[PDB]
Paper text:
The comF operon encodes three proteins: ComFA, a DNA helicase and two proteins of unknown function, ComFB and ComFC. In the present study, we characterized the late competence protein ComFB from B. subtilis in vitro and in vivo. We find that ComFB is an obligate dimer with a dimerization interface highly conserved across a variety of bacterial species.
The final native ComFB structure was obtained after molecular replacement and refinement into a higher resolution [2.48 Å at an I/σ(I) of 1.98] native dataset with P21 symmetry and four molecules in the asymmetric unit. The four molecules are arranged as two dimers, each with two-fold symmetry. The structure of ComFB consists of four α-helices, H1–4 and a six-residue extended β-strand-like loop between helices H2 and H3. The extended loop, formed by residues 42–47, is wedged between the subunit's N-terminal segment and the α-helix H2 of the adjacent subunit in the dimer (more on the dimer below). We observed an anomalous difference density peak at the position of the hypothesized Zn2+ ion in each of the four molecules within the asymmetric unit. In ComFB, the Zn2+ ion is coordinated in a typical tetrahedral arrangement by four cysteine residues. Three of the cysteine ligands, C25, C27 and C30, are closely spaced in the primary sequence. In ComFB the fourth cysteine that completes the binding site comes from the C-terminal tail, residue C88. One type generates homodimers of chains A and B and C and D respectively, within the asymmetric unit, burying a total of 1550 Å2 of surface area (for the A–B dimer), with 11 hydrogen bonds.
Numbering used by the authors:
A (entry chain A): 1 to 91
B (entry chain B): 1 to 89
Write the structure that this text describes.
């Protein structure tokens, strides 16, 4: 299967560090918006071997690399918090 | 709900030019390699609404832009052909 390994990384960081990103709404819509803003800000890393995504995801341990990504998510989270899409929860 | 629109463009362009790229193997595995190498050389364009990906397939039918992307396809095609993944055959 054809998949950008950065999307796997983000989705993982987003789920693990959801609370420290301080989102106004946590519905799937708002979450997808954060992901999209963030994935459009990192260089694509498409692969075809699931074993290869495992290697990438492992390289971004709790120590070292993940912080730069958490910062982009947080930043994107701010934007979605203030300017939510019309497809989000309403009333 | 979460797709890179470039992915929708490259797939549509590949299955319109695949038989012109002089690819060594044309199995799904090598096709994925081509798409992956190509997707990695263009800027991501992630979307969340379904209304964009539908019309995105129409404004890619327009040219000049896809020409730049065709080149990419072809350049990706040469690499995959020259060095096929061991998941192919
Ligand atoms: Zn929401
Ligand atoms: Zn092949």
């Amino acid at each position: 299967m054809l998949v950008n390994s950065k999307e796997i990384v983000m989705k993982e960081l987003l789920d693990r560090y959801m609370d420290q990103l301080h989102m106004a709404c946590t519905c799937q819509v708002c979450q997808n918006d954060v992901l999209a803003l963030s994935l459009n800000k990192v260089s694509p890393s498409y692969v075809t071997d699931f074993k290869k995504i495992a290697y990438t995801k492992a390289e971004l341990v709790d120590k070292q690399k993940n912080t730069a990504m958490l910062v982009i998510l947080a930043e994107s989270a701010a934007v979605v918090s203030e300017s939510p899409s019309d497809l989000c929860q309403t009333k």
